[PDB]
Amino acid sequence: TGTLVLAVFSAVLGSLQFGYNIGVINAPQKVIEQSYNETWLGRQGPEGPSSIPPGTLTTLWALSVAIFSVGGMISSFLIGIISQWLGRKRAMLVNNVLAVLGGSLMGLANAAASYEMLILGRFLIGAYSGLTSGLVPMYVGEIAPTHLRGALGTLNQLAIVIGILIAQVLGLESLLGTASLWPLLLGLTVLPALLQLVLLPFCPESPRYLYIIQNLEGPARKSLKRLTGWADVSGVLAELKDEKRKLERERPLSLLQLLGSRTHRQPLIIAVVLQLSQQLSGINAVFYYSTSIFETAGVGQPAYATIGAGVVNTVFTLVSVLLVERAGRRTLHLLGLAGMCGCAILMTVALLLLERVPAMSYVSIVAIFGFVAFFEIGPGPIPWFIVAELFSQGPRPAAMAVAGFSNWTSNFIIGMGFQYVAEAMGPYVFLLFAVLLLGFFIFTFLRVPETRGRTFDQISAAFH
Ligand SMILES: C=C1[C@@H](C)[C@H]2[C@H](Cc3ccccc3)NC(=O)[C@]23OC(=O)/C=C\[C@H](O)CCC[C@@H](C)C/C=C/[C@H]3[C@@H]1O
Ligand SMILES: *[C@@H]1O[C@H](CO)[C@@H](O[C@@H]2O[C@H](CO)[C@@H](O)[C@H](O)[C@H]2NC(C)=O)[C@H](O)[C@H]1NC(C)=O
């Protein structure tokens, strides 16, 4: 099993970088912004009014995050062609080259006295994150033996949340996240990638790609032998043959082909809306700007509350992994949406009443965890389960891509928008989220079927 654990470790490193890049931006905000101010003057010089105008600074920061999201969008398109063209191991190695480039670009920003470098590096690391999110679950699913798929599936989510937590604690004022060393955080994401790059070459090649696509059996047999370790792997390749037959009897549809098939619409729309509900809920607000929200809410020390949100996210990630096994899909999503809406109407009230009762900050504090809590129960994992079980074997891949694209695009909006909205609306920002959640809830409650313990067969009938 040694090769198995090593390969799963490499995949987990990929997911860990992905999570770290998701969450590293939150803590150093009030330091990176001051650095931006510093460079923008260094540039202007004699005319400078002794301060970067707030509009430009807000725009640059919102760009610094929305560009991660844009790299994700661009990543959603390619996830397929390269996977079939180069494979999985080679794909992760090249994609790690991209990761190293992006991390170096982000790290060398301040020394270069320019912030365009940081934004470009964030674009590169967004492409990294999208590619690894696409390629890691696939690889672990290929290598995973017949009966450990369920155990390893939750690893791709445990790793992401743990990475968010690590980046969330590695940004304290005393820790790396200070004026002189902040680039180290944005540079730390170079180190694990290098490690992966120096570990993967020893790791095996996913048998399914090797046999199904490149139609070599001998190397597939060798990879299987070094993966599971049995003397003979006749049974697993015999099983591979039947799914080869199934794939050749159902050629996956093309993206424009899939969008052009009237039969697949009602499923498709469902998927897309779910992703919006997962994204336009407003969780990425809590993942990116939670330090600023807490500081606005009057919290005593926003950074500690930020790590608190991270740890609650992790705890209820594990709880959801325990739950989804024995609860359902539709019910979990409705519960999560309803919980997030009331929790955000609490937070709105807490902000609105902060002046009158100073202790309300604690309320706000707890509210956010509740928010995060509920997100990890219903809409965190579930939309992906619904999408996966909604579509047949053939048209699943293309559909996935579209969902991913939507999941990224919505993200961009929130990632790019929140700050402006935060300034325009006031305390009521989360109230907007509540309305959106309420909307989605109603739609879900009356439109999405129940996929757990159901045949694609019946589901199709349910849509009819
Ligand atoms: C808040 C977010 C972060 C925190 C995660 C969040 C938690 C999660 C992670 C992993 C699986 C299921 C749920 N729920 C997510 O959906 C999450 O992560 C992913 O989707 C990651 C990989 C997927 O297997 C393929 C899609 C990967 C991308 C196409 C979409 C990524 C979504 C992010 C999301 O931005
Ligand atoms: C941007 O940089 C300038 C200069 O470093 C900051 O100006 C200092 O700001 C503090 C607090 O506002 C004042 O007490 C100092 O007198 C200012 N020094 C100078 C030389 O002007 C400015 O505040 C910064 N603004 C932002 C938004 O970062």
Numbering used by the authors: 21 to 484
The paper states:
The major facilitator superfamily (MFS) glucose transporter GLUT4 mediates the rate-limiting glucose cellular uptake in adipocytes and muscle cells, and thus plays a vital role in insulin-responsive glucose metabolism. At basal state, GLUT4 is primarily distributed on the membranes of the trans-Golgi network (TGN), endosomes and 50–70 nm tubulo-vesicular structures known as the GLUT4 storage vesicles (GSVs). Upon insulin stimulation, GLUT4 is quickly transported from these intracellular structures to the plasma membrane, resulting in rapid consumption of glucose from blood. Among the SLC2A members, GLUT4 is most closely related to GLUT1, with a sequence identity and similarity of 65% and 79%, respectively.
The elution volume of nanodisc-embedded GLUT4 is slightly earlier than β-NG. To stabilize the structure of GLUT4, 1 mM CCB was added to the purified proteins. Following our previously developed “guided multi-reference 3D classification” and “seed”-facilitated 3D classification strategy, the resolutions of GLUT4 embedded in the LMNG/CHS micelles and nanodiscs both reached 3.3 Å after several rounds of 3D classification and refinement by cryoSPARC. In the structure of GLUT4, the amino terminal domain (NTD, containing TMs 1-6) and carboxyl terminal domain (CTD, containing TMs 7-12) enclose a large cavity that opens to the intracellular side, a state defined as inward-open (left). CCB is accommodated in the big cleft between the NTD and CTD. The macrolide ring of CCB is coordinated by Asn176 and Trp404 through polar interactions, and Phe38, Trp404, and Trp428 through hydrophobic interaction. In the cryo-EM map for GLUT4, a characteristic glycan density is observed contiguous with Asn57, exemplifying the unique power of cryo-EM in resolving posttranslational modifications. None of the GLUT4-unique sequences, 5FQQI8, 489LL490, and 498TELEY502, is visible, likely owing to the intrinsic flexibility of these segments.
